[PDB]
């Protein structure tokens, strides 16, 4: 079984980030190396101020250990990192690897603004991290921050997509992930001919934690199994829609918990056969 490094935050309570990546990627037939970039009592939306461990001095030791133990990784998914130093540490470790797949979710902001504690220093560190990525999955706010364009609710995909590509290696893909078209929500990217493609599914009411994390985990898992980008995005969006639908069907009293994974895990097992 292939090995997938996943580096992102772990919140003990919340059902998002590394806690949701582990079940998904394990079900998708990877041996997951689950590396917290931060450790939190709960995620940061709705439980009050969480108790957090700073892992900035641990990760360097982790990479040094794996290096000496002669561990090698097939594929990697990098999610929320959270500090300039950790971005830089991850960037150089990954450069030491021969990765067949690197997916970066360049978590930086939403609704037109940087997340709290993130400033243009973090933006620069992210631009360095994405340099070897095969695929990046910014939202519309993150795309604008990376290129340095002023935020637009509806940027010109014909302008912003080439601008983003200009920072990636030849053959890599910038996929913008929360693009709305009429009643749809989905992903937009440039095909090999340079034409903007859109892949979406009918938007469901409400807002749900962990959707981007699970989308990234599914995209990484599919690409890692050799599925071309377009059918990968088609399936990820279908799966993304199905998980949100199951979440709604649970009639939850607690709106903080991340998207349900049961129907998604069932779909994965069916794909495996
Ligand atoms: N309300 C919703 N209805 C249907 N699908 C959704 C909804 N919210 C998110 N999704 C799906 O999950 C994907 C990831 O959402 P995105 O906005 O990128 O996540 P995040 O805010 O967590 O980064 C979207 O592309 C879409 O596929
Ligand atoms: Mg996202």
């Amino acid at each position: 079984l292939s090995t997938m490094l996943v580096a992102e935050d772990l919140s003990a309570v919340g059902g998002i980030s590394l806690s949701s990546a582990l079940p998904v990627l394990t079900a998708m037939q990877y041996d997951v190396a689950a590396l917290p970039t931060s450790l939190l009592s709960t995620h940061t939306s709705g439980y009050g101020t969480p108790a957090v461990v700073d892992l900035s001095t641990w990760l360097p030791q982790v990479f040094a250990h794996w290096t000496r133990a002669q561990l090698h990784f097939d594929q990697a998914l990098i999610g929320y990192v959270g500090s300039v130093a950790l971005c830089q540490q991850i960037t150089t470790y990954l450069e030491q690897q021969t990765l067949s797949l690197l997916v970066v979710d360049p978590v930086l902001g939403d609704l037109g603004q940087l997340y709290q504690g993130f400033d243009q220093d973090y933006v620069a560190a992210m631009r360095q991290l994405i340099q070897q990525a095969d695929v990046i999955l910014p939202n519309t706010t993150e795309a604008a921050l990376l290129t340095g364009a002023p935020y637009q609710v509806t940027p010109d995909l014909e302008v912003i997509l080439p601008a983003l590509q200009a920072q990636l290696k030849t053959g890599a893909h910038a996929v913008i992930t929360d693009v709305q078209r009429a009643d749809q929500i989905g992903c937009a990217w440039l095909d090999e001919a340079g034409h903007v493609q859109y892949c979406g599914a009918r938007r469901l009411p409400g807002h749900y934690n962990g959707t981007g994390d699970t989308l990234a985990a599914v995209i990484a898992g599919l690409l890692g199994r050799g599925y071309p980008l377009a059918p990968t995005l088609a399936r990820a969006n279908q799966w993304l829609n199905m998980a949100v639908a199951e979440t709604i069907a649970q009639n939850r009293t607690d709106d903080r918990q991340g998207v349900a994974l049961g129907d998604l895990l069932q779909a994965i097992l069916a794909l495996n056969e």
Side-chain angles (χ1 to χ4, degrees):
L1 280 196
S2 98
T3 303
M4 173 70 74
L5 170 61
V6 183
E8 56 180 344
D9 53 306
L10 172 64
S11 33
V13 167
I16 60 155
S17 37
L18 195 60
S19 85
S20 60
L22 252 165
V24 170
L25 284 161
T26 299
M28 297 183 73
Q29 300 173 154
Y30 297 91
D31 286 337
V32 174
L35 179 64
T37 52
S38 177
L39 182 51
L40 310 90
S41 52
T42 68
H43 66 59
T44 57
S45 322
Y47 303 90
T49 305
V52 179
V53 184
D54 176 0
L55 299 172
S56 64
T57 76
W58 179 64
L59 252 71
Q61 298 184 239
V62 174
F63 297 143
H65 179 205
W66 292 349
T67 290
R68 96 175 59 91
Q70 303 188 121
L71 301 180
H72 189 56
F73 295 103
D74 294 302
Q75 295 112 355
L77 168 56
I78 313 301
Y80 171 90
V81 174
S83 80
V84 167
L86 285 193
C87 271
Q88 301 178 139
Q89 288 273 341
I90 292 166
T91 303
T92 73
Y93 177 74
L94 293 170
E95 298 181 42
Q96 301 170 194
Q97 316 310 309
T98 305
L99 294 184
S100 67
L101 179 67
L102 176 52
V103 176
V104 176
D105 185 354
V107 176
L108 300 177
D110 198 17
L111 299 195
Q113 285 177 353
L114 284 159
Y115 294 135
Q116 282 179 45
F118 283 167
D119 53 10
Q120 293 284 134
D121 293 337
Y122 193 71
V123 176
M126 191 56 49
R127 293 187 177 124
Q128 297 312 298
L129 181 50
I130 70 179
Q131 286 198 342
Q132 286 185 134
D134 298 297
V135 172
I136 63 166
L137 316 154
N139 66 33
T140 298
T141 300
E142 289 157 350
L145 291 159
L146 291 170
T147 61
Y151 174 67
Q152 284 177 40
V153 194
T154 303
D156 187 354
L157 297 167
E158 299 279 356
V159 176
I160 192 158
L161 288 180
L164 281 165
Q165 290 292 342
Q167 294 188 49
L168 307 179
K169 65 196 193 174
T170 310
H173 308 281
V175 180
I176 299 178
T177 52
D178 62 355
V179 175
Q180 308 208 338
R181 282 194 185 167
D183 40 40
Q184 299 230 118
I185 189 177
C187 288
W189 74 107
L190 299 167
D191 69 18
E192 267 162 58
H195 299 319
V196 185
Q197 304 297 139
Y198 180 83
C199 191
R202 196 170 292 263
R203 187 167 180 253
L204 309 181
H207 165 78
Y208 306 90
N209 294 326
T211 50
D213 299 335
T214 293
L215 182 75
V218 165
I219 288 167
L222 291 169
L223 292 176
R225 281 194 190 188
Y227 289 99
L229 181 66
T232 290
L233 291 179
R235 186 171 280 148
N237 281 278
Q238 296 165 12
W239 286 4
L240 252 300
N241 201 251
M242 184 191 52
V244 169
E246 184 184 3
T247 306
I248 301 170
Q250 291 186 352
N251 295 315
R252 291 171 172 196
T253 55
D254 187 337
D255 66 2
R256 301 166 292 188
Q257 187 67 26
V259 286
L261 297 178
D263 288 351
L264 171 57
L265 294 181
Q266 186 172 228
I268 291 159
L269 263 61
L271 186 67
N272 293 352
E273 277 139 54

